[PDB]
């Protein structure tokens, strides 16, 4: 009941108040306790993917929202970890919205921290939802996120060794399958590290 | 009360660039109470103003 009414008002103010960056004054004006913060982030992502198309206002509301307090960005890290557990459970059309919001917050990189480690599943084990969505978020996030500085700066950020599928050298299927999937997805020279390491 | 003597807007591109500065000092966000009791702090329309009662 509390999450149903909280989602009814959160969705009512979500569909209203154009330029949601200003609507954050109302969202924070609701004064929801810490118990409603995690449910407000999960239901906030549900309303973000509930639209008929990818909306940048959801990415801005998540960037400023999660960027407000410590438990906010923490709720974005844990909520992103719970979002990584969706995979095939997520909708096909909503996967592009999750890749647009996750690519928008990933372009800023502020709130997400270990999200780069939670991604990159194994070589032959995938639901194709995280592979296709990883290709959409990798292409769009590569275009708008400064891919040369994102891959070059990400190589020294220790995000690749923290990710399972991004690990070069030892594992032949991770580096080789990462070179075939990356080069096949349009990464180009970004897979040269796993290609030479493999 | 009202806008009083001010009609709508009066300004100039050269006057604003001379009076103000794109790069200037920033300390406090222009406290209105500071300019209230200090008619020299706010130079906009100082006409027919009874003010400046110092302390107590």
């Amino acid at each position: 009941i509390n999450l149903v009414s909280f989602r009814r008002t959160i969705y009512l103010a979500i569909q209203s108040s154009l330029d949601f960056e200003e609507c954050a004054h109302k969202l924070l004006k609701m004064e929801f306790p810490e118990s409603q913060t995690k449910e407000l982030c999960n239901m906030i992502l549900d309303c973000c993917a509930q639209q008929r198309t990818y909306e940048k206002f959801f990415g801005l509301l998540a960037g400023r929202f999660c960027m407000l307090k410590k438990e906010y960005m923490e709720s974005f890290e844990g909520i992103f970890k719970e979002q990584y557990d969706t995979i095939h459970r997520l909708e096909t059309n909503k996967l592009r919205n999750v890749a647009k919001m996750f690519a928008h917050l990933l372009y800023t990189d502020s709130l997400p921290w270990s999200v780069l480690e939670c991604i990159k599943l194994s070589e032959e084990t995938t639901t194709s939802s995280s592979r296709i969505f990883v290709k959409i978020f990798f292409q769009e996030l590569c275009e708008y996120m400064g891919l040369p500085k994102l891959n070059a700066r990400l190589k020294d950020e220790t995000l690749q060794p923290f990710f399972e599928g991004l690990l070069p050298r030892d594992n032949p299927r991770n580096t080789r399958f990462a070179i075939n999937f990356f080069t096949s997805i349009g990464l180009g020279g970004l897979t040269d590290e796993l290609r030479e390491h493999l | 009360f009202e806008p009083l003597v001010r009609d709508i807007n009066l300004q100039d591109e050269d006057w604003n660039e001379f009076n103000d500065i794109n790069k200037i000092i920033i300390r406090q966000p222009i406290r209105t109470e500071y300019k209230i009791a200090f008619p020299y702090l706010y130079n906009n329309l100082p006409h027919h103003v009874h003010l400046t009662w110092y302390h107590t």
């Binding site: 954050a24 004054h25 400023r64 | 009202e2 806008p3 966000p29």
Partner: peptide
Amino acid sequence: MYNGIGLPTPRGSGTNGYVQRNLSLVRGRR
């Protein structure tokens, strides 16, 4: 007309929207 914001005529449009600072302006300032 408050500091930095105000409407000369409060009766001019609708009602005076008691604005504050927005829970997001502090996020952008920090």
